[PDB]
Design an enzyme around this catalytic site. Structure first.
Site, PDB file in Angstrom:
ATOM      1  N   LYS A  48      -3.619  46.219   3.074  1.00  0.00           N
ATOM      2  CA  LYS A  48      -4.058  46.815   4.330  1.00  0.00           C
ATOM      3  C   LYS A  48      -5.059  45.880   5.026  1.00  0.00           C
ATOM      4  O   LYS A  48      -5.145  45.861   6.257  1.00  0.00           O
ATOM      5  CB  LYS A  48      -4.695  48.188   4.077  1.00  0.00           C
ATOM      6  CG  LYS A  48      -4.791  49.097   5.317  1.00  0.00           C
ATOM      7  CD  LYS A  48      -5.694  50.314   5.056  1.00  0.00           C
ATOM      8  CE  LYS A  48      -6.081  51.044   6.346  1.00  0.00           C
ATOM      9  NZ  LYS A  48      -5.061  52.045   6.776  1.00  0.00           N
ATOM     10  N   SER A  50      -5.472  42.323   4.427  1.00  0.00           N
ATOM     11  CA  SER A  50      -5.188  40.891   4.318  1.00  0.00           C
ATOM     12  C   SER A  50      -3.779  40.598   3.813  1.00  0.00           C
ATOM     13  O   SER A  50      -3.165  41.445   3.188  1.00  0.00           O
ATOM     14  CB  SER A  50      -6.172  40.239   3.342  1.00  0.00           C
ATOM     15  OG  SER A  50      -6.074  40.838   2.063  1.00  0.00           O
ATOM     16  N   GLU A  51      -3.278  39.396   4.105  1.00  0.00           N
ATOM     17  CA  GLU A  51      -2.149  38.796   3.382  1.00  0.00           C
ATOM     18  C   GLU A  51      -2.696  37.723   2.428  1.00  0.00           C
ATOM     19  O   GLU A  51      -3.767  37.177   2.650  1.00  0.00           O
ATOM     20  CB  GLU A  51      -1.124  38.169   4.343  1.00  0.00           C
ATOM     21  CG  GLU A  51      -0.536  39.127   5.373  1.00  0.00           C
ATOM     22  CD  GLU A  51       0.863  38.734   5.833  1.00  0.00           C
ATOM     23  OE1 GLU A  51       1.049  37.622   6.380  1.00  0.00           O
ATOM     24  OE2 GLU A  51       1.784  39.547   5.649  1.00  0.00           O
ATOM     25  N   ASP A 155     -15.110  48.737  -6.192  1.00  0.00           N
ATOM     26  CA  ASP A 155     -13.659  48.797  -6.314  1.00  0.00           C
ATOM     27  C   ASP A 155     -13.186  48.187  -7.624  1.00  0.00           C
ATOM     28  O   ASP A 155     -12.264  47.363  -7.653  1.00  0.00           O
ATOM     29  CB  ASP A 155     -12.983  48.114  -5.132  1.00  0.00           C
ATOM     30  CG  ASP A 155     -11.525  48.468  -5.034  1.00  0.00           C
ATOM     31  OD1 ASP A 155     -11.129  49.472  -5.664  1.00  0.00           O
ATOM     32  OD2 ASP A 155     -10.697  47.809  -4.369  1.00  0.00           O
TER      33      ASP A 155
HETATM   34  N1  LIG Z   1      -8.294  34.227  -7.202  1.00  0.00           N
HETATM   35  C1  LIG Z   1      -7.081  34.697  -7.269  1.00  0.00           C
HETATM   36  N2  LIG Z   1      -6.181  34.183  -8.161  1.00  0.00           N
HETATM   37  C2  LIG Z   1      -4.891  34.641  -8.274  1.00  0.00           C
HETATM   38  N3  LIG Z   1      -4.392  35.613  -7.547  1.00  0.00           N
HETATM   39  C3  LIG Z   1      -5.264  36.136  -6.665  1.00  0.00           C
HETATM   40  C4  LIG Z   1      -6.597  35.776  -6.434  1.00  0.00           C
HETATM   41  N4  LIG Z   1      -7.177  36.530  -5.453  1.00  0.00           N
HETATM   42  C5  LIG Z   1      -6.225  37.367  -5.054  1.00  0.00           C
HETATM   43  N5  LIG Z   1      -5.032  37.160  -5.775  1.00  0.00           N
HETATM   44  C6  LIG Z   1      -3.624  38.010  -5.554  1.00  0.00           C
HETATM   45  O1  LIG Z   1      -4.055  39.000  -4.426  1.00  0.00           O
HETATM   46  C7  LIG Z   1      -3.947  40.390  -5.167  1.00  0.00           C
HETATM   47  C8  LIG Z   1      -5.182  41.080  -4.851  1.00  0.00           C
HETATM   48  O2  LIG Z   1      -5.497  40.904  -3.462  1.00  0.00           O
HETATM   49  P1  LIG Z   1      -7.125  41.282  -2.929  1.00  0.00           P
HETATM   50  O3  LIG Z   1      -7.845  40.066  -2.937  1.00  0.00           O
HETATM   51  O4  LIG Z   1      -7.374  42.475  -3.858  1.00  0.00           O
HETATM   52  O5  LIG Z   1      -6.826  41.663  -1.478  1.00  0.00           O
HETATM   53  P2  LIG Z   1      -6.972  43.163  -0.604  1.00  0.00           P
HETATM   54  O6  LIG Z   1      -7.399  42.869   0.934  1.00  0.00           O
HETATM   55  O7  LIG Z   1      -7.696  44.077  -1.418  1.00  0.00           O
HETATM   56  N6  LIG Z   1      -5.476  43.440  -0.540  1.00  0.00           N
HETATM   57  P3  LIG Z   1      -4.494  44.775  -1.115  1.00  0.00           P
HETATM   58  O8  LIG Z   1      -5.153  44.986  -2.317  1.00  0.00           O
HETATM   59  O9  LIG Z   1      -3.266  44.103  -1.493  1.00  0.00           O
HETATM   60  O10 LIG Z   1      -4.644  45.791  -0.123  1.00  0.00           O
HETATM   61  C9  LIG Z   1      -3.607  40.029  -6.632  1.00  0.00           C
HETATM   62  O11 LIG Z   1      -2.717  40.906  -7.243  1.00  0.00           O
HETATM   63  C10 LIG Z   1      -2.956  38.552  -6.658  1.00  0.00           C
HETATM   64  O12 LIG Z   1      -1.598  38.609  -6.450  1.00  0.00           O
END
Ligand SMILES: Nc1ncnc2c1ncn2[C@@H]1O[C@H](COP(=O)(O)OP(=O)(O)NP(=O)(O)O)[C@@H](O)[C@H]1O
Ligand SMILES: [Cl-]
Length: 331
Positions: A48, A50-51, A155
């Site tokens: 929601k 970011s990509e 979180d």
């Molecule tokens: N440092 C990292 N190393 C490897 N994968 C990563 C890393 N940071 C993020 N990811 C990937 O991004 C996912 C988590 O995204 P996050 O950073 O939690 O974004 P968000 O804005 O919370 N997005 P969403 O959770 O998808 O609504 C993980 O399951 C991985 O696929």
């Protein structure tokens, strides 16, 4: 009747004796980097907020991860950048390598180190009793550090914990909901994921603290040792407080909210019932008993308390006999 206030028992005045530029993320300048240094390879996921792309630093061939943020609020965006910078180098906190403007989306893009993660569905069906203590200690190092730098995560859940099981490397990621603990401050109760919301969020108590993270860590642990994912499985935020109460009981729930002069949402009169506190021995069976021990239940018991003030802090938790079997670091 207005709620009684509350302070953190630890790290209460960290941000009161740090400079303004430490915690005031609003008045923070972003030092941009060359976006041409990074070349996107693969989409890993859509959120929601970011990509997220796997990518390659063209300047030194390093593998890398690029979180391109969707436009929401410059307040929230600078906050994530400033908390990551403050926490850079701390144990098992994910490292922010750079910040660039994506030319297509026209929004900031956070470049992190790469972690060769394993799917958490594959991984929690395979951890031995030793592995669970090992990684729990590793998450604790991270939580006590960020708490000691005056920052709650808000979180904490299995998706936000990247584990490279090959190298036994662990990293706490996604500091997008993290915030600075300032005493007296009322926070938004709409944080964390449902299954891992502590009761303070569920009864609308806004003066919470670092210890919110400990409740969530307790939920993670309950599912790992009892092999029940998720351990408190609620259908919505109202049913979530009921599932907790089927396990921890309503007498201690009422003591908790009377102590802070919190009134329940009237809707609870018709769904909450009265429930005895259950003994942890009930959740034990043939398929998870190798993961349970007296010291695991003792630890779990001190994390999953209603009173946020009576929960183990991260440092106290690291001192528990549950972690005596885990190999430390004299050299
Ligand atoms: N440092 C990292 N190393 C490897 N994968 C990563 C890393 N940071 C993020 N990811 C990937 O991004 C996912 C988590 O995204 P996050 O950073 O939690 O974004 P968000 O804005 O919370 N997005 P969403 O959770 O998808 O609504 C993980 O399951 C991985 O696929
Ligand atoms: Cl918020």
């Amino acid at each position: 009747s207005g709620p009684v206030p509350s302070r953190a028992r630890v790290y209460t005045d960290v941000n009161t004796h740090r400079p303004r530029e430490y915690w005031d993320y609003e008045s923070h300048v972003v030092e941009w980097g060359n976006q041409d240094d990074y070349q996107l390879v693969r989409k890993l996921g859509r959120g929601k907020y970011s990509e997220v792309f796997e990518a390659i630093n063209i300047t030194n061939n390093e593998k890398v991860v690029v979180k391109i943020l969707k436009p929401v609020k410059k307040k929230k965006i600078k906050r994530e950048i400033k908390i990551l910078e403050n926490l850079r180098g701390g144990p098992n906190i994910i490292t922010l390598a750079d910040i660039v403007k994506d030319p297509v989306s026209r929004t900031p893009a956070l470049v992190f180190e790469h972690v060769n993660n394993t799917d958490f569905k594959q991984l929690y069906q395979t951890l031995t009793d030793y592995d669970i203590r090992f990684y729990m200690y590793e998450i604790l190092k991270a939580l006590d550090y960020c708490h000691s730098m005056g920052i709650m995560h808000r979180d904490v859940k299995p998706h936000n914990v990247m584990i490279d099981h090959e190298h036994r490397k662990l990293r706490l990621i996604d500091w997008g909901l993290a915030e600075f603990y300032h005493p007296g401050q009322e926070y938004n109760v709409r944080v964390a994921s449902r299954y891992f919301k502590g009761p303070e969020l569920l009864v609308d108590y806004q003066m919470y603290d670092y210890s919110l993270d400990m409740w969530s860590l307790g939920c993670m642990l309950a599912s790992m040792i009892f092999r029940k994912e998720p351990f408190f499985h609620g259908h919505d935020n109202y049913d979530q407080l009921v599932r907790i109460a089927k396990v921890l009981g309503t007498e201690d729930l009422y003591d908790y909210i009377d102590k802070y002069n919190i009134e329940l949402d009237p809707r609870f009169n018709d769904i909450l019932g009265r429930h005895s506190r259950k003994r942890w021995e009930r959740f034990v069976h043939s398929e998870n008993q190798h993961l349970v021990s007296p010291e695991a239940l003792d630890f779990l018991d001190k994390l999953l308390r209603y009173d946020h003030q009576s929960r183990l802090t991260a440092r106290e938790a690291m001192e528990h006999p549950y972690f005596y079997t885990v190999v430390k670091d004299q050299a």
